[PDB]
Each structure stands twice: as C-alpha cells, then as structure tokens.
Design a protein around this ligand. Sequence first.
Ligand SMILES: [K+]
Ligand SMILES: [K+]
Ligand SMILES: [K+]
Ligand SMILES: [K+]
Lengths: 67, 67, 67, 67, 340, 340, 340, 340
Amino acid sequence: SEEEIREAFRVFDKDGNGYISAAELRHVMTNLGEKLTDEEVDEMIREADIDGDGQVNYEEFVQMMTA
Amino acid sequence: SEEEIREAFRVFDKDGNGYISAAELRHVMTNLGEKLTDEEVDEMIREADIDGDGQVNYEEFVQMMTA
Amino acid sequence: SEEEIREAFRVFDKDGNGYISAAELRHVMTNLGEKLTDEEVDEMIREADIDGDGQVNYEEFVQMMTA
Amino acid sequence: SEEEIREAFRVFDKDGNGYISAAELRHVMTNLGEKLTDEEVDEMIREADIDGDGQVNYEEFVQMMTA
Amino acid sequence: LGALRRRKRLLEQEKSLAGWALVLAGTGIGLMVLHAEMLWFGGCSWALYLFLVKCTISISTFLLLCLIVAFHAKEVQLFMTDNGLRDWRVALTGRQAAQIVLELVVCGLHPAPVRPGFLGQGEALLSLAMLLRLYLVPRAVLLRSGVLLNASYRSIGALNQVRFRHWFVAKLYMNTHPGRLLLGLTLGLWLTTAWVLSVAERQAVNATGHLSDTLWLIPITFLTIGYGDVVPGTMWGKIVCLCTGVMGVCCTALLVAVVARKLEFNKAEKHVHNFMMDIQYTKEMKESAARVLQEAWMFYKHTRRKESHAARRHQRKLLAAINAFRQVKLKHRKLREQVN
Amino acid sequence: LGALRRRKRLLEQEKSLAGWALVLAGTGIGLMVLHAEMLWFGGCSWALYLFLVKCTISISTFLLLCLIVAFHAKEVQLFMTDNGLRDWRVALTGRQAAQIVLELVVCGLHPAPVRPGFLGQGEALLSLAMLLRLYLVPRAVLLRSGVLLNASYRSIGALNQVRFRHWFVAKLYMNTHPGRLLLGLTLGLWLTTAWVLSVAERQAVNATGHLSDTLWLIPITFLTIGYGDVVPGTMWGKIVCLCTGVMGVCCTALLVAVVARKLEFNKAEKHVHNFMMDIQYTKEMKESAARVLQEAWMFYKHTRRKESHAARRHQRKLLAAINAFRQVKLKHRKLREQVN
Amino acid sequence: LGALRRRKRLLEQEKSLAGWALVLAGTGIGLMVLHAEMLWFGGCSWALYLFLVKCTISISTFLLLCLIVAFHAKEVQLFMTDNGLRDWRVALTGRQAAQIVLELVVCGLHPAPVRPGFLGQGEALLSLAMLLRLYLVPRAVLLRSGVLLNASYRSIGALNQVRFRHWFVAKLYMNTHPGRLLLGLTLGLWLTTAWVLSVAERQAVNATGHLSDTLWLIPITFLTIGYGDVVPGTMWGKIVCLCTGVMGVCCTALLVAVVARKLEFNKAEKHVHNFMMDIQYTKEMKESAARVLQEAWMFYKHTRRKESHAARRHQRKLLAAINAFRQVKLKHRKLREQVN
Amino acid sequence: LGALRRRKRLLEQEKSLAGWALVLAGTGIGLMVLHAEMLWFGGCSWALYLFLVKCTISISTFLLLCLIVAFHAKEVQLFMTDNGLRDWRVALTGRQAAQIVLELVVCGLHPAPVRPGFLGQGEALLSLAMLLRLYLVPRAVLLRSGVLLNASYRSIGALNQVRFRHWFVAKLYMNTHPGRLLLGLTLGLWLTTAWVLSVAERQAVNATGHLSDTLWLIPITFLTIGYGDVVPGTMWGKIVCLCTGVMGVCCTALLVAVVARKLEFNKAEKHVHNFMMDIQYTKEMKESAARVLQEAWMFYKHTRRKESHAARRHQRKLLAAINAFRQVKLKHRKLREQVN
Ligand SMILES: [K+]
Ligand SMILES: [K+]
Ligand SMILES: [K+]
Ligand SMILES: [K+]
C-alpha cells in the first residue's frame, strides 16, 4: 500500500542507490525532528536486520514494512 | 440540398466506409431517443431498399432522400 | 515638392506602369466626385500634351506639374 | 576598493584603450560640472606623474588612487 | 444571378420599412406628452382640442400597426429565398407567430378617444404603457449601421457568427468613441424619468412634485448623493427611485471599465518612452562619471595638501556618487536587457 | 470489478441522502415565519393552532437530525473503500468528530414547546438561529453539479493536479451566466434581511417599523443612497443595517469585475473589425488621389486665368489633401504592420 | 543650414510667449477675487480703492490681448518654415481665423469700469467668466515638457505620426508621478469651487452661505457622503452642486484604474517569489519524509508493544503524512514545471 | 571568516531592539486612554491615581528614548562593516542626523506631570500627538518577516538593486491571502478613529458625542451611507470626518483590485473546463445527428402517408435539426482551432 518508494529513498540518499547504512538512516531520522539514543540505534539495527548487511535495499524490503 | 454528408454518415459509422447495415442503422436510431419495433425495422428495410444489399451507400443514395 | 508619386500613380494604374492614357485619366477623374464634358477632355488633352503620346509618363512629367 | 574601472574609463575614452592624455582628462573634467585653469592642468600633470608618460594606464594606476 | 440582386433589393426595402416605424412611434409619444401636459394646465375649459389630439394618436397607432406586418412579411420572404423553400406554409413557425402577436398587442396600447385636471388610473397606465415602443430602436440602429448591408460582410461573417448580435454593434460603438454616447444616455434618462416621476407624484396643492423638484431629485439619486430634503411620498414614486440607482451603478461600472482601458500605452508610445529613458540614463551615467572623477581628485588634493580634517564630507560625496553610478549602470543594463 | 460500481452506487445514494436534508431544512424555516406572523396578528385568541404549528417544527428537527449521521456514515464508507482500510476505529479522526458534533448542535436549534403579541427574548433568538441551516446549500449545489458524478471526470481530476472546491463551481457559474444569478441574489437578500429587521424593530400601537417601512429602507442602504427619512432606532436594528452595506460593496465590486471582462472582444471579432476598417482605409486612400489631382489641375487653370482668388483656396485644399493622403498612407501601412 | 536654428529660436520664443501669457492670466483672476471680497466686506465706504483695483484688470487684459497675437504670428512663421511657400495669404485658413477670433473674444471679458455689497447680475457673470482663461495651462505644460524641444524627438514623432497630443503627456505624467498630481487636483478644486458657490449663495442675514459652510458642503458632495444638514437653496447654487458630483465619480474611476496597476509584480519580484516558494517546498518535503519514516517505525514498535490505540493513532498520522507528502510533491513538480 | 557570523549577530540584535521598541511604545498609548477616561468618569478626588498613572508615561517615554540611539548605532555599525571603514568620521551624514533628531523629537511627546473633567487644549493635543509612534510598525514587520534574515537569499538578491521595501512586503501579504488583513484594518480603524472623535466632541451634560454615537456615525461615513441623524458639530470633529471618507474610497479600490484578480482561472482549470464542455459538445453532436436521421425518416413516412400537416411539422423540425447540427459543427471546429 505504497508507491514512489524510489523517490522516497532517493530523497534521503547516501550511497547513491538508496542503500544508506544503518548509521546513515539513524542520523537522518535523529537530525530531523525527534532525537533518540542507544534504544533508537538498536531499533534501527532491528529494522535493517531484514537486509542483514547494512545496505538497506528499500525496493525489496519496503513491502513488508508498508504491509 | 445538403452538405458534409460524408461526415454525417461517418458520425454513425459501423463498416468504416459509412455502409452500416440495416440492423446497424436500426439500433443507431432506436438507441438514441425514440425507440420502435418491427414496423420501424420494416420501414428501415424499405428505405434501404434503394441500395438493395444492406450496406447503405449513402454518398449515392442520399440525394433522393434529401431531395 | 512631392514624394511617393510612384504609388500615387500606381493607385490609379491602367497600363501597369502608370502610363494611363488621356481617356483613362479622364474617366478616373470624372468617376470620383465631379463630372464634366468636352471642356474636361480638352483640358486633359492639354495636360497630356507634355507627353505628346497619350501614355502619361508621370515619373518624368510630374515635376513641372507639381512645381 | 573599486570595480569596473575598465568600463568607467571606457565611458570617457579618447585613445581607444582608456589611455587619454592629461589634456584629454582635463577637458573631460572641465566640460561637465566644475571648470578650472592652470591649477587644473598642473593637477592633471601631478595625477599623470604616476604614469609619467601622459597615456593614463588606469588598469594599473587606479588601485593607488582608489586606496 | 437574379437572387443576388433580389436579396439586396428586399433588404433595402426592409431598411426603410423599419426606419419609418421609429418616426411613427415617436410621434405617438410626442402627442401623449403634449396631451398629458395640456390636461393639467389647460383644465376643463379645453375639450375640443383634447378630443382632436386624442384621435391623432389612434390614427398613428393604426398606421403603425400596418408596418410591422409588412416587415414580418419581408422577413418571411427573405427566409424563404435563403432556404430555397417554395411553400410559405412551412416557413412560419409557432414561436414566430407568438412573437408577432405579442408585438402587435404591445404596439397597440393607446389612451383611445373612448368615452378635473387629474388623469384616471386607466388612462395614466395606458399612456405610460406607450414607452414600450422603444424596442424598435435596436433593429433600426443595426440595419442602419451597414455591418449587415454588404454581401461581403455577410459572407465573411457567416464563417464565424452567422447572426449579427446587437452586442457586437454595441461594443463597436463603445470602443470606437465613448463619452459622447455615455453623455447622451445620461442626459436622455434624466428627462424621460423626471416626467414619469412628476406624473406619479403630481400634487395640486402647491405643485409639491412637479418638474421643479424631480429634476433636482433624480440626479442626486442617480449619483447616490441622496441628501434627503425632497423624497418620494407615493408607492408609485418609491419604485421609480429604486430603478434609478440600479441604472447608476451600472453606468458607473461601465465608466470605470472604459477609463481603465483608455489610459494604456501603445507600441509606438512605449518605444518613444524607452528611447527617452535610455538617453536620459546615458546622460546621467556620463554626468555621474564626471562627478566621481572630480570628487576623487578633490579628495586626493585635500589629503595631499593637508587641508585639516574638513575633507570628511568629500569621502561621503565620493561614496554616494559611486553608489549612484552603480545603480544607474544596473538600471541601464536591465533596460537594455528587456528592450533587446 | 466490484469497487468501480460500489463507488458510484454509494455516491448516488449520498446524493439523495444530502438532497433530502435541503428540503427538510426548509420546512422549519417556512414554519417559523408563519408562527411568528400568526402570533403577531392573531394575538392570544389562537393558542391550539400555535401549539400544533410549534410541535411540527420539533418533529421536523428530529427527522432532520437523523440524516446528517447517515450522510457522515456514507462518507466514512467512501473513505474506507478509497484508502482500503478494514477497521472503523482508524477511519474517524478527532477533527471530524468535532465537526459532526458541531453540525448536530447547530442544526437542532428550534423554539420547542417547553412551556401578548411580542416574542420574548430567548425565543426570538432561537427562532432567528434557524437561518444557520443554510450551510447545506453549497454542498448540495456542488455535489449535484456533475463534477463528481462522472467517473471519467473524477479520474481525470486526480491527474489534473486540481481538487474539487466550491470556488471552482462558483467560478463556472459566474463564467457561464452571471446575469440571472446576481439579480437572484440581490432579490433574495432583500426579503430575508427585510424580515429580520422588521422582527428586530416591530413596534405596536404606532404601527411604525413593519415591512412597509423596511422594504423601503433596506434597498436604499444596499445601494449607499441613504436618505434619512427612516432610520433604525434599536441597537439590534443598527447592526443589521450596517451588515447590508458591507455585502453591497462586495456586490458592486463583483459587478464591476464582471463588466470589465464582458466588455472585451473575442478572437474572431478582432479579425472582423480589422477587415472592416481596412477596406474603408483603402477606399479613402484611393479616393484621396482623385481630389488631389482635380485640385491640382483646377489650381493650374486658375493660375492660367490669373485671377488667383480661388487659386489661393485651391492651393490650401491641395496642401490639405496632400497631408491627408500622407496620414492615411501611414495609417494603412501601420495597420498592415500589425495585421501581418 | 539655418533651418534647425530657425526652428529652435522660433520654438524658444513661443515657449517664452506662452509662459508670459500664463503669468499674466493669473493677475486678473487674483484682482477679481480681491475686488469681489473688498466690495462685500469693505462696503460702500471704499470707492477709490475699488476704482483703482478695477482699472488694473482692464490694463492687464489689454496687455494680455497682444501676446496671443504674437504667439499666433510665431505659429504662422513656423508653419511657413515647415512648408516653405513665402505667401502669407495662402498660409492662413478660415477656421484658424475663426479660432483666433474666438480666443480673443474669450480672453477679453472682464468687469471694466464702464460706470451696497452685492454684485448686481451682469457683473457677477462677467467676473466668473474670467475663469475660462485656464485653457492656456495645457499649452504651457505640454510645450515646456521638453518633448518638442529636441529634433531627435520630432524625428520619431513624425515617424509614428504621434503629433504629441496632450493625452500622451497626461498619460506620461500619470505613469511617472501618480498620487501627487491627484492630491493637487483634489485640493485645487475644493478651493476654486467653494468660492463660486459662496458667490452664488452669499446671504447678508447671518452669512448663511459663506465659506464657513461651502468648505464643509463641497467635500461631502465630491465623495457622495451627502448628509443633508446644509443644502443649496438657489438654482445657480444647485447647478454647481451637480458639477461637483460628475467629476467626483471620474476621479474615483481614475483612482481605481491607477490602483489596479500598482499591485502587479515586475519581472524580478516573480523570480524572487518563485525561489522563496521553492526553498520552503523543498524543506517541508524533507521534513514530511522524516515524519513519515519516524511515524512508520514508531507505529511498528507500538504494534510490537500490543496496545493498538497508539497504533491506530499512528496509523492516522501515517496516512496524513503520506497524503501531505504526495500533495507537496505534486505542488513542487507543478511550480517547477511552471518555472521551467 | 567571522564577518559572516558578525553580520548575522548584528542583524539579530537590530531585530531584537526593533521588536522591543514596538512593545514599549504601546504602553504609553494604552495608559493615555486609561488616564483620559479616568479623568472624565472619575472626576475629582482621584488626583493621586492620576499622578501615578501619569508618571509611568514619562518613565516609559524615557525608557523608549534609549532604544532608538542604540538601534541607529547598530545601523551605523552595519553600514561601516558593509562598506569598510575605521575610526568613524564618514558614516554619519547630515540627513541621517536630521532624521535621528526628528525621530527623537517625535517620540518624546507626552503629557508630562509638570504643574474638572475636561482636558485642556495643551494636554488634549499632546495626548493625541502620541499616535505618531506607529511609524515603528512597518520597520518591525519588515525586519521580523525574515526577508533580510537568510544570508544566501540576501546575497543572491543583491545581484540587482532589489532595495527591499515595505511595498514589496505589502504586495506579498496582499497576494498571499487578503480578506484577513483587510478585515483587520477595517475593524481596527473603527476604534482608534471613533475614540478620537469622542475626545473631540464630548458633552458634559446630556452626553451626545461619546462612544454610543461615534461608533454609529463612523461606519456610515466610511461606507458613504451618510444618513444625517447624527453629524459632527465641532471643527475638530469635522476635520476628522473628512479623513474617514478618504480612507473609505481607497479601501473600495483595493477591494475591487483584489476581486478582479480573484475572479480568474488558473492554468489547469481552463483545461478541465475545456474537456468538460468538449465532452458535452460531442454528445450533443451525436444526439443531433440521430435526431436529424429520425426526423428525416419520419417525414418520409408521413409523406408516404399523404397528410400534409404532420409532414409540414416534421419538415420544419428537420430544418431546425439541420441548422442546429451545422451550428454545433461550427462550434466544434472553433473548439478544435482554439485548443490546437
Ligand atoms: K455612495
Ligand atoms: K451616499
Ligand atoms: K446620503
Ligand atoms: K442623507
């Protein structure tokens, strides 16, 4: 139930292919709006555990998150 | 005493050349506005009897009708 | 003390080069506005006497008239 | 602390390259607004003393004046 | 080839046949006004003159009613010739017959000579119903304008708009030259309404509502400058005063719309203004350059000769002249940008 | 597909569900006026009729309060089918609940029969609080306009980067035919405003303040033509008469804006006018030369006869004709420049 | 070639003559005002002073009646130079002589000393007939504006056949310096009209119509705010109060037309606004994406915590953020396409 | 480089000092009204409270006269940093000093406590002289809006002489969202003007000029609906009723100019409307062709039936259908020409 995930990830693009690492997405989320800590970085690691390699493959692992 | 009969027939075009059959003109006339029955289909057959083949050649047998 | 005499004569052009004959200029003058007679045609002949051939070469014999 | 000295000198250009002589700059200055005399010509000589040749090379001899 | 001249012949006939009806309709109004004003001042002593002037109106109405039929017959002939029909039975529609009978019943209302200074209600309404004959003006104006007379005009108009609307002629007259038409409309409505209001509120005590007061009351209602020293006091006089402000607001809107357009430049005026601005800019630029060089030398000499500290204003003048020169340079640059 | 028909079925259902509220909300307004004018003229002799006509208002309000909920439920169903949700808990938001409760608390305000010709305050405010039910009109007008009825239009609107709004349909109605709508508004605001002020300033014994005086005062304030013969004398009547000039200035501005656009030419009219003026320009240009040559020859003949008395005038005419020819030539060349 | 020198010297002489005529055309008006006020306040005691101030008006008129002839002689010489024919008999037209006669008879009207505080009629009209000398103002304003002072200007003027009509100069002044001119006109008409009305309605009982009342009545008529506490009571005072209402609407139309233009952006302001919108759109899009991701993860965590109420609220927030992001993306693409 | 941060710090300081002056200049205005009303209603036996409430005004004025010198010092520092200079002797010009002293003398006017319910002329003028402190509002609004805040935006705008002016911000607020601002101005000018008039015209016995009458007289003058039941009776009240109509004529022009722009389509609305009307055009064309065919067949059948009444009716219907089909074909051709 989502669309334009390509542009959504390219907005906060760090590696050029939307595969921003866990720390990349962490500082993207913390800098804009709310900020958090070790709990947030553990939560981000859990979220990126679907890929299991750091390079968040959004185009594949967005469907489960948006389902 | 008429003009643009080519476009007038191409409006209700069925065979691509304005040669819509008797049933074609029948359902064209009945669908839009007034509707009728066996009497109307017999009258349409009589009107198209000038062609004598079903494929109404309007560009030839329209002058007598419009005269 | 005049200019655009070429277009002025081309407006009332009869022979295609502004060489309208005495009768040509006569009916041009009489048709628009006032009308006249034998006196007018004699006056036109006197005016065209500068050319001496009927085909009034305005571009040459207009300077004396406009002087 | 200046810019577009090239255009500033080209506005009052006399030798084509902005190298107007002392008399040239003198009559340029006196023509518009204030007017002066032997004092002005001596002042022009003093101003051109930096160049020392009459041809006012403004491109090089403007930074000291504008400093 | 005969039809190409027959159509023009019948149209030229229609031109005069519609032009004469306007005069024969204006005559009736001219006589009704005279009779109404004669019955007031004249009194009951004048009766034969009133009877003689009340019958000419009936004669004029009878003569007018014989021209509308001829005009419509000419219209039917024109339609038959244009459409090529041979039978007049199919040329006439029900709507046209209704319009014709409505025209003939509207145009036929007159006081009539049938059967002391005050008009009865029936006569006062029948006389005021004679002003409806002004619907003949637009057709006469359109036919006299010439936009429809020529064959070439009709041929070129048939491509875009087959029927020449009155609004086109109205817009043409408005844009060719306003002012005269608007003044005529304003000064022709302050006389045909004052008389109606005086008829509505004519008092025999001290002439409390005659033309000496309505001619003052109408303009200050049309311009919404209502003072309050004189006001209508009759139900039939409170409605003529609400139909006058409606015709004033619309006139003000038209005046505003015309004035908004009337003050716009054209291409040649813009070019002349741009040329003047450019030459002024160049002159200002050269003067500013002379000023900056002169002031720079003045400040340098003041510093060189050590003329105390009075040369402080020289730096101010130098900076102001430099910034002005930069501003005028930028203005000339942008001007050359848009004009190119 | 089921959804492609369910969407249209639900929209058509809510069309009638919202159109019936517009006619069930007019009954209360039409009954409150009748009850007030019955209590005024009728007096204390009529009580059973007043009770019967007052209970019908409560019944109508009860029947009206059961349609807003149905309309909102139908809208929530559309929200679910559009966003694909399955739980009704997430469909409703706090702002929508506040809007619903505000609608249900503003619709249900009537002078219910809880318990000698004047409406005691507290009831004359509940009665006049029923005019707030007119917020239903724009919703029904927009929803019945067909912009949302068609499936193709609704599908195209998403890709057209535009959202349906009351402003869009209002602008469409203004563009299509503004002549009827403006007069309808101006003649429907001169009654619902003239009844409220009569209620505010209803005076007994003196019989001064009823509709016979209000229908004269309201129109001379909307047009800013205040005379001063009748003025409000109650604090509640001094606020209704300055809320009329505010919505009269806006109407004047709307009329001016409409007229300014209505006075402009269309595409083909400019070409028609250009051709009509160009042919006349050519005719005048060709006619000028004949007068030029005739005057030149007549001046030559007059010099030949040596009188010179008419020759001076002929020379003046020749100069005038020459300059006129130059002017018309320049004008024609300019016209050919713009047209090409 | 001395033709340019001849034209320049003739134009300069014409400028000087037109300036001096306007200078001498105001002394007469000032002396008229002074004498009219002295005869009122001074009374019959002062007679020698009245005679002395009345003879100077005749002297000034005699001195004025020669500058017009000199100016027209300069015009004739300029016409000869531009159309060299060396025959003064043919250069003068009949209508030009008629307009010269009209100018001389208009400018020569004054209350000459041919023979208690009231101006007998026939002299109070001759005095007020001296205000027609203001037709010299447009000439002295146009000819001194510098547009005619340069041959380069005249070259393009002949190229476009502008003829330098007064309308062009008026439009240039309106475009260049609006506001100051409008206040000048509106404050120079409230003093020259408040004196004419005072002359028309000057009462010797208790000064019922002197400047203490006209200065209050005129400004509330120009603005159509007619109160009705003071009103004109003389026909000659009533006609004046209708000529201050017809030019109180034209001024309003001019003000509206001027104001309508000043609210439009130029080329640079549009670019500045576009950039200021683009930066805000980009930053809000970034913030919206951040909110979307944070809310999605928080909703997932809350579902992992099994509460479902914060989860449904976060679902609502997620839907709101998603549709806001879609809307802002659509709008950003829209104005990016507009800029491109 | 620290200059970039220094400029931002200095501009933030300028904003803070420009904002604090705006709230320290409102205290004096709020206390003068309280003191005047206390002196009016309270009368005598309140001298102590009057003295305390009057000394606070002087204290506030003394505190305000120190927030202008510091602001101008910050301005001088900014000028020096931008241009580049040391040991200030140049930045302070003469015009700037005159402006500073004018500001300090305008801001320092108050009813000082030096040395029965009626204010004296000196105090009644000094108190009303405190409204001139409202020139600080545009500066604070311009500085607070952030148009001068961003360094990159200011740098890119510095390419051309934008000269950030109050007019640009006013136009931005006008086109952003009107209505709110105009309503605020109208409802804030009906109190600060109705209190000044009450001060000017205030009667000790049988008060006929207090806020119970001015709040009625002012709104019917701003809208030019002057009735005449209450009018000013003092010269100082007449001069303030002529400055209210001037601010009412300009507001109407502003409203008309706003509405004229607000009644226009955007880019996508034109396309949507064109598509909507084109669909109807096509469907009407199809239906008209079907009608033509059906009527032709019916007429042929009726002619076969040999009864020449319905035959004539059907022939007329056929002709009408044919002409309507031609008209709609021409309209669709115009549509295709204009859309392509
Ligand atoms: K008004
Ligand atoms: K008014
Ligand atoms: K009034
Ligand atoms: K009044």
